[PDB]
Amino acid sequence: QCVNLTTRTQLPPAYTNSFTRGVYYPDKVFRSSVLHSTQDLFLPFFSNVTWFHVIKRFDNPVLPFNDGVYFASIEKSNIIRGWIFGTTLDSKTQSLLIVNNATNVVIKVCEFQFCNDPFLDMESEFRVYSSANNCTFEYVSQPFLNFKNLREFVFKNIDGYFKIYSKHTPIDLPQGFSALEPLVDLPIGINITRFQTLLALHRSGWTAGAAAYYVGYLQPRTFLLKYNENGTITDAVNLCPFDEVFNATRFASVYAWNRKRISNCVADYSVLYNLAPFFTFKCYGVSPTKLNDLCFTNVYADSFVIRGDEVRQIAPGQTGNIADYNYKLPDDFTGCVIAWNSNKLDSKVSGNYNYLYRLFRKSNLKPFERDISTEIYQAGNKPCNGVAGFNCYFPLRSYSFRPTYGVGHQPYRVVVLSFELLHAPATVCG
């Protein structure tokens, strides 16, 4: 629930000097009558900050949060309320929300869906977010609060820490020196890259009083701090020919899968990463993006032809006839399987009987094992000596190929790449 505003006036931003602003305690330690140097994100002297004025005038822009921000605001009658910190300001990311109503101060981080124009409006209207469903961190804190009031705020996000700095003192930006003690340390541990402010509008309707605030940037610079006896701060100063195995006219049998070993080269996966015809890139264990970074000491290649059903069934979580009696994947597999359609070839006028596969086996098959299916199979009590009987026969079967099958009922050219870990030095690392 948000209300769009179309009365905004566009003016160029103004700039204000930053002579003696942007100084705080480097740490919780206390030092007196000694000069100490620290390396931390401060605000260098004679820097440039941007002048924002509120008076209708409702300048509420959005600026990126590259580094720490120094917030200086001359304040009267409680105009500003808080700030929004977030990356994209939607439900897809986690964003902060700081509001200080008439009772207390609550700090809540959720998946707030900020509208185009979030603001606040006695105060009984809070149009900041729609809803949230999955968020846990919620915090409640003590209330932190002619113009006569000035506030300084410095926000830093280092090592997943959100430190807020507050200082209240009476009074264009005045020239002077003041301390800035830490108040609350909160370990939010979230990514922040953009920020925006909040403006409160008072109905009569939606009127904003004379208020101004400054936004500054922080840079790493060494500073010198001088103390005294009272304990206060006074002043500051050889490639593998993969085309042979990826463009061969003929492959081996399904049950008699060819065994090949090619090494002593570099792994140029970008050559086949951009290929057009293949559409399957299933991988387990190692991500494809990292695959061009780490070093593998073993490279194995397999050459066989089979339809996409076995390509989907190659996962160890499911079984099958081929997946149990012909070829199965080990449980600790870390490789990948690549398959592509080859309907343009391997389809003659008649059927092709050059590819055969096993059907029956007594028990399971150990992975990466060579087995020859040439003996007779027996099922009854009386075995046969090669006789094609009722219970005794040959498990092997032929194939039938036609150009009028279904969407996925076509043979695919399947190549299997497996990666193994061993103490032996790697022969292929590039």
């Epitope: 006839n321 059907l359 029956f360 009590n381 036609r402």
Partner: antibody
Framework: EVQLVESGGGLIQPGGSLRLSCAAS????????MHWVRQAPGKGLEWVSV???????FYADSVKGRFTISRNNSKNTLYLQMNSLRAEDTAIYYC??????????WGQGTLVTVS | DIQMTQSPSSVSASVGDRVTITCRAS??????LAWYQQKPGKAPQLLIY???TLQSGVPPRFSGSGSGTDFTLTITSLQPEDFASYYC??????????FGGGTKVEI
Amino acid sequence: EVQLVESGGGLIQPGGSLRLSCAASGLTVSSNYMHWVRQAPGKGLEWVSVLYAGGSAFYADSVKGRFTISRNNSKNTLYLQMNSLRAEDTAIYYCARGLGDYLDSWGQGTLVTVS
Amino acid sequence: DIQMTQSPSSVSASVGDRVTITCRASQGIGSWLAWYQQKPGKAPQLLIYAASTLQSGVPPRFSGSGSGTDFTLTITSLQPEDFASYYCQQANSVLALTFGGGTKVEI
């Protein structure tokens, strides 16, 4: 020269446990696939359950759960067990054996009714 | 994903006639079709397998011809003994056989 026998029919309440027996004659169930098929009155055959020659069983989408098959090689008898049944699940059941892509062996059946 | 259907449902013909019973498949199955008989109150029997060959013991009456989609069973003479139903069996890579409706032949 091949025959099959079945036992286990009777009166079973809906959502109950029933055990079926299928003793192969002349064939060993540990070396060949087991097949189950139903013939409803006024309807046709469709998938029921098929046990592999190893220690694995295949089920369809509707019968993925609630089914547990543990064959015994001591007496060469196929065992079928389910824990829940509906009002539309009663028909004649046949245990069967066959080769790849077609089934040959058949037999009689046991009838069970629910109410 | 896959379903079998049969356009004929009940065809009556004499002994010297052709039933012309076929099974319709959405996608193409290559020579993996078998036809069975369902006798009311009796055990089923084998007729053919793979739609090209003949099972041993089956009398030479039931035949078939079709590459991927158009399969038609041909009977030279309709004997009075084999008056049962017809079912078409097709399977994918795994042994997931699919069956359609039944066609009844009456005198």
